[PDB]
Amino acid sequence: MNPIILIIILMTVMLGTIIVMISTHWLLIWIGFEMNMLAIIPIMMKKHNPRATEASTKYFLTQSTASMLLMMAIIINLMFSGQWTVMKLFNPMASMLMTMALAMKLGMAPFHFWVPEVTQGIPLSSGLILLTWQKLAPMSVLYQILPSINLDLILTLSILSITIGGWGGLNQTQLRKIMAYSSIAHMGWMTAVLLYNPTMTLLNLIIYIIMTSTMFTLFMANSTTTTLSLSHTWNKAPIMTILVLITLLSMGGLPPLSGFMPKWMIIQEMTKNDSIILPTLMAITALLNLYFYMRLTYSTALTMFPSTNNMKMKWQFPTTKRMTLLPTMTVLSTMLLPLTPILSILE
Amino acid sequence: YPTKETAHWKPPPWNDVDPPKSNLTLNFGPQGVLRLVMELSG
Amino acid sequence: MWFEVLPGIAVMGVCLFIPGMATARIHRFSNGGREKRVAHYSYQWYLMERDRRVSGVNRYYVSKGLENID
Amino acid sequence: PGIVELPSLEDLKVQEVKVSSSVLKAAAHHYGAQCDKPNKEFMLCRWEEKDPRRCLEEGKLVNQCALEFFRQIKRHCAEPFTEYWTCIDYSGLQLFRRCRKEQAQFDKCVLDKL
Amino acid sequence: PFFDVQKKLGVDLDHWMTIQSAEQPHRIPARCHAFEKEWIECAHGIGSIRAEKECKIEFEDFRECLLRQKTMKRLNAIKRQRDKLIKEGKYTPPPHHSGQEDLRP
Amino acid sequence: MNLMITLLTNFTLATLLVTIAFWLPQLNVYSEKTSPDPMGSARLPFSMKFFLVAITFLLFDLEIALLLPLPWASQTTNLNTMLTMALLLIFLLAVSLAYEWTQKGLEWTE
Amino acid sequence: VAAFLKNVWAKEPVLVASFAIAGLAVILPTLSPYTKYSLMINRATPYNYPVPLRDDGNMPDVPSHPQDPQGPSLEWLKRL
Amino acid sequence: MSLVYMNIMMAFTVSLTGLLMYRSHLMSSLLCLEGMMLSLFILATLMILNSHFTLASMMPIILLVFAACEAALGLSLLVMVSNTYGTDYVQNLNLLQC
Amino acid sequence: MMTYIVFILSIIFVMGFVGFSSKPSPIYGGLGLIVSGGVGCGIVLNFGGSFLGLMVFLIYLGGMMVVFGYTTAMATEQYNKVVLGTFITGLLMEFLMVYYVLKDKEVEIVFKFNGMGDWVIYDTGDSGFFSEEAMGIAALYSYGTWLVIVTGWSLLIGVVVIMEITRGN
Amino acid sequence: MFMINVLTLIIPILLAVAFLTLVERKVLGYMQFRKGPNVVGPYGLLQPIADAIKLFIKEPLRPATSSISMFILAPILALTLALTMWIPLPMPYPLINMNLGVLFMLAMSSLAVYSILWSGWASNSKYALIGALRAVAQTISYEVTLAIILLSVLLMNGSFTLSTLIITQEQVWLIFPAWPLAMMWFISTLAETNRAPFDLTEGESGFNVEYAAGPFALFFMAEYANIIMMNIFTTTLFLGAFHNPYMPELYTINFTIKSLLLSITFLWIRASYPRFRYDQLMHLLWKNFLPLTLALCMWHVSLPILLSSIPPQT
Amino acid sequence: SMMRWNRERRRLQIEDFEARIALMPLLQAEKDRRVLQMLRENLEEEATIMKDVPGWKVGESVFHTTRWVTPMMGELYGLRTGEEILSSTYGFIWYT
């Protein structure tokens, strides 16, 4: 791919997301979603492998069904309201259709089946672009329509996403599938608090974006795709293993790291509304996310798996990858707890 | 945690590239006169 | 010589002159000896319906003149 | 909810202007020039009241004044107007440009007689 | 998040197409201009909760103009009762509803 | 009603002619033929060029659909904006054509 | 520059003609003094009804009759 | 609501159920998706033309063009699948189960 | 029975959908989609949308379904119970809705549907010397600057994407 | 009464295409130093009748088609879209007066390729399928250039009504301000109907070779009706005649003479040039015709604005 | 030549349009009286049909406001013949 064409395609993705974010018309939301899908399709086809083609086909079919359901919801709201302003919807059927459309777009369970599939078949940079940038626009659309969101449906989707993400990440050996199931659990966390306080949804979105960016940047820097190469990383560079141990510690919500910051705040907005069973259940389920993070830290940094003879050659060459914002994202994702009230800038 | 169902599952290749798993041939008959056997590539 | 191709062109010209003449004569016959009214917009159709409703025959082509007023 | 207030059939009765569309289009410009005041008053009443039932009497004035137009055509300029509206009535699109000489004769008779 | 770029920058990108009572080419009015106008001038600046609990009358009127549920329900009732009385023989259609009216103009 | 009548007349004349052409010499008595082309045994190989010109036609057809209402749009009051948007649409069409030209898109079906 | 232009006029006259026509089309409306005539021709077409205004008492510029001298004129369109 | 609204919504529903149950091919599912888009087009333009929404008449054409562009993209993906396994069967797209 | 013409057309429309929702073959599915597109163009023709109906005929049928069948001819090589079964099932439910809404004149599945004709909800006015839908589309350049910009950029990006992803290198 | 008008429209089409086959044979023969048919009838006037009766009593091929529905349906659609496409023609008054007759004709032009596609698919020979794919690609490419040229010419006209083209050409012809568009439109309509030098199936296979004598005859009738109507469309679009509302026969005779001359020009072009290659005609469209079409489209968008020459909507 | 003829065509078009806007008020008044007559006839028929049905008020508006609402086509031609309905609601669309 040409650098100019790749740059133009990336700005097209950014323009589509911005168009969804800044528009006050439903047709422009739909237009931005199609812009985003059409411009992100070739990034998944960067290597021209059969797995990339199948992943792009599955992503295309799921996004097409989601966009068509979104247009059906827009048309129903047009009929029953006579206007296009992006605000609360004026039909429960249109609200339900739009909610399941955005759940299919975000990868919420039980529409999650493409997320561990697709992320396995695409490169690491494209998977990072997916799992971080593609989740901004549907979360904005969910933010704007929360007066019409059914509570039962969104809480069912949240608990299903958290449980299925934990039980799915409990099994994998590949890193990309682990990050996919972790993403599913995290969006269950973010949507569980949406109807009570969306500022916590914004805070959890930002923290999840920083953590996923740090982990994917570490994986790109070490060129690791399975757990065994991540185990091998201890011989080549120990500082990378220390960084992935600290980041995986923070991703599990272990205090005093910054990953304790979102979910705890979420509990603080759900015991105010006298809902005690749900946050306790969600923390108990997120213990499984902590479990497979602990398994990864056991394999990587807390022990030393055996290495090979050719690794000695890799001792003679310094790394030359542009590890952009890796120290900043490592610091920001782990020592951000003593600046917890800064979330008030998102209110 | 392998079970009976996921017993034949192989690990993905390290480069994530699978093995890739023809020339068209035409026969123009005698329908002066000439029979041509042509091999094309598109 | 070259003019022996002219009977075929004459037959084709007759066959192509037939539909236009037939359409013009049918339009003049079926609309009171005048051109068929063109209703491309809703205002012209409203005018045509007003003539049909004012003729008393339920035929728009029977135009009532100044004799129909007091 | 409420009951719709509707005028009786005696309030809707008036002497109609029973002419065709080509008759009206032949004398449209002179009708606009001469019968301007009741037409403008009726249209202002319609656009301000936003209700036909509140404008009915004004509408009656139109159906009076326009009739007083056509009678003045019938008394003085019947034949050139007859020729002009027939020439307008022939064509399918009722074009003004196909009837220039009859329009000129009708306008000359109207100007020198009215 | 909804970043109001348009209101901050003063530009107009899609506000002309959001509602139905907006400025139209050749000032062509829609069939429910007045109802939606009244609903909009009610619900302006009072919030969604007060908008949905305070002028439900205007929103019901606008929805009735939009979809005409009650109008065709009343028409169904009238036509059904007319058909029943026609079958029972106690009603006949007047001549002006049969096609011999010699209408107004 | 006139257009539907004309469509039905054309359709019924077409199927009458097809039925006559397909069944009139069927009533004649003749002798049958055995069940048996240069590529009978060979499979059809895929060619990327025909699919490429098909999708190029589809995209240019969509931009043609966008460009179509210009005769109605020329009667507007914002003449500067209409002229700018029309020229921008045709310029983007030409830019797409030139970019397909430069990247060897129109090769061997030029 | 002149050698390049003669070269492309030698090899590809079609592209040269197309680019010349496109450049003329894109620079000529900004120079012709007849665009404003198009603008006020499109403005002067009466698609809608000129609904009258209620006379409050002080409107000297608006006319009272269609044939009054007040209001806009159309002699320029009649002559051009 | 009107009768044609029920018929168009039922058409959208049966095309959605046709999409969600793959039989053998992928072209058939793509055709089902374009049928869904066509039903959306018809419903939107019926609602728009019924209520005399003047400006909104610009909308369904866009609803065509964008979605039609998407259809082209889908076709290309199918061709890529046809370049790998020689057929557009959906039972060859299972390389990512492990 | 003439006054239900649009409704009658709508029946064929949903019937055509069962032509390709059962998915018999891409050629027969394309034929069913062609019939459905023509019927939908007739439906929007009966509502006054002439330009949009000819958009359906010019761009959907003659533009996009041509490419769909053209790519179909490069697959599904030439030479069931389930296809006929779901066709019969869908036809039976469709005629059940037809019979019920023609019987009691008011049904419901998700929304309340009325059993009268389509002619009731029409407008009694006249549009004047223009077609309202025609000027609504014609306002694409005068009003829809942003829509034109994003659509043109989308089509250009789509051209780039299409010729990029099928290179294979 | 209206069905009489429909029949008087559609039966002279069949008579005209039969005698167009006769006129083609005679004019083609006289241009290469020989005669056409002059033995069967007086100057060969009975030749199309003999050809029709011969073709309708020949034994049908009965090919081993994969599908019989497409095999039947392709002549159905071909003849239907050949005959339906004549109705909005203003000669000087159309059968069906429509607001968007140009768009209607363009829609049927785009829709006519399904006969080629279904004929190629229904035949069991894959070489016929390849030929049908190439013909479809050629037709849709020249459909694109036809649409752009028609858009620019109608932007000069100002409305999609086909009868307005007579009014807008009262002073001067549109071949005087739009002769490059006229030339490119003529070549595009030549390449649309698989006419020489743009036919490919005759040279080195055909898509309709597997059809019987009857269906081949019906395909021939559809193609020749398309040729005649396309010439009539070019005559109406660029070479409009003087129309008198009191004597329509003047316009009828005038445009009949002009369209006859254009059809003779089609046959004249057939007997002058060698056949194009497929990639050569793709090169002619995508690299020569399309840039000039886009440039002239920009020019005709901007020209009425800068000249105060915007035509009326009505 | 085209610019000269197009300017003349624009002048003729605005002449026709000004004739139409001169003719508008009479047609507006006629349309108002016609729709009021149709609504009155429908009201009388509803009065003589619904004398038996309990809980029915003759002429009950379906709107909470007292503002005049333009009559929907089914409210005008509800009790008329089929051919009048067809000519009123599909006469313009089906006219060639």
From TrEMBL, chain B:
Secretion signal span: none
Family: Belongs to the complex I 49 kDa subunit family.
Description of how the protein assembles with itself and partners: Core subunit of respiratory chain NADH dehydrogenase (Complex I) which is composed of 45 different subunits. Component of the iron-sulfur (IP) fragment of the enzyme. Interacts with NDUFAF3. Interacts with NDUFAF7. Interacts with CERS2.
Protein name (record): NADH dehydrogenase [ubiquinone] iron-sulfur protein 2, mitochondrial
Originating species: Ovis aries
Boundaries of the shown chain within the full protein: 53 to 103 of 463
UniProtKB/TrEMBL annotation, chain C:
Record protein name field: NADH dehydrogenase [ubiquinone] 1 alpha subcomplex subunit 1
Function, as annotated: Accessory subunit of the mitochondrial membrane respiratory chain NADH dehydrogenase (Complex I), that is believed not to be involved in catalysis. Complex I functions in the transfer of electrons from NADH to the respiratory chain. The immediate electron acceptor for the enzyme is believed to be ubiquinone.
Topology with respect to the bilayer: Single-pass membrane protein
Organism (species): Ovis aries (Sheep)
InterPro entries in the record: NADH_Ub_cplx-1_asu_su-1
Description of how the protein assembles with itself and partners: Complex I is composed of 45 different subunits.
GO cellular component terms, semicolon-separated: mitochondrial inner membrane
Subcellular localization(s) per the UniProt record: Mitochondrion inner membrane
Main location: mitochondrion
UniProt family annotation: Belongs to the complex I NDUFA1 subunit family.
Key words, A-Z: Electron transport, Membrane, Mitochondrion, Mitochondrion inner membrane, Respiratory chain, Transmembrane, Transmembrane helix, Transport
Entry superkingdom: Eukaryota
TrEMBL record, chain E:
Annotated spans, Disordered: 84-105
Disulphide-bonded residues: C32-C65, C42-C55
Compartment(s) of residence: Mitochondrion inner membrane; Mitochondrion intermembrane space; Nucleus
Family note: Belongs to the complex I NDUFS5 subunit family. Belongs to the akirin family.
Function: Accessory subunit of the mitochondrial membrane respiratory chain NADH dehydrogenase (Complex I), that is believed not to be involved in catalysis. Complex I functions in the transfer of electrons from NADH to the respiratory chain. The immediate electron acceptor for the enzyme is believed to be ubiquinone.
Protein name: Complex I-15 kDa
Protein's organism: Ovis aries
UniProtKB/TrEMBL annotation, chain K:
Keyword Transcription: no
Protein location: Mitochondrion inner membrane
GO cellular component annotations of the record: mitochondrial inner membrane; respiratory chain complex I
Keywords carried by this UniProt record: Electron transport, Membrane, Mitochondrion, Mitochondrion inner membrane, Respiratory chain, Transmembrane, Transmembrane helix, Transport
Superkingdom assignment: Eukaryota
Membrane-related topology note: Single-pass membrane protein
Coiled coil: none
Family of this protein: Belongs to the complex I NDUFA13 subunit family.
Subunit-level organization: Complex I is composed of 45 different subunits. Interacts with CARD15, but not with CARD4. Interacts with STAT3, but not with STAT1, STAT2 and STAT5A. Interacts with OLFM4.
Described purpose of this protein according to its UniProt entry: Complex I functions in the transfer of electrons from NADH to the respiratory chain. Accessory subunit of the mitochondrial membrane respiratory chain NADH dehydrogenase (Complex I), that is believed not to be involved in catalysis. Accessory subunit of the mitochondrial membrane respiratory chain NADH dehydrogenase (Complex I), that is believed not to be involved in catalysis. Complex I functions in the transfer of electrons from NADH to the respiratory chain. The immediate electron acceptor for the enzyme is believed to be ubiquinone. Involved in the interferon/all-trans-retinoic acid (IFN/RA) induced cell death. This apoptotic activity is inhibited by interaction with viral IRF1. Prevents the transactivation of STAT3 target genes.
Organism of provenance: Ovis aries (Sheep)
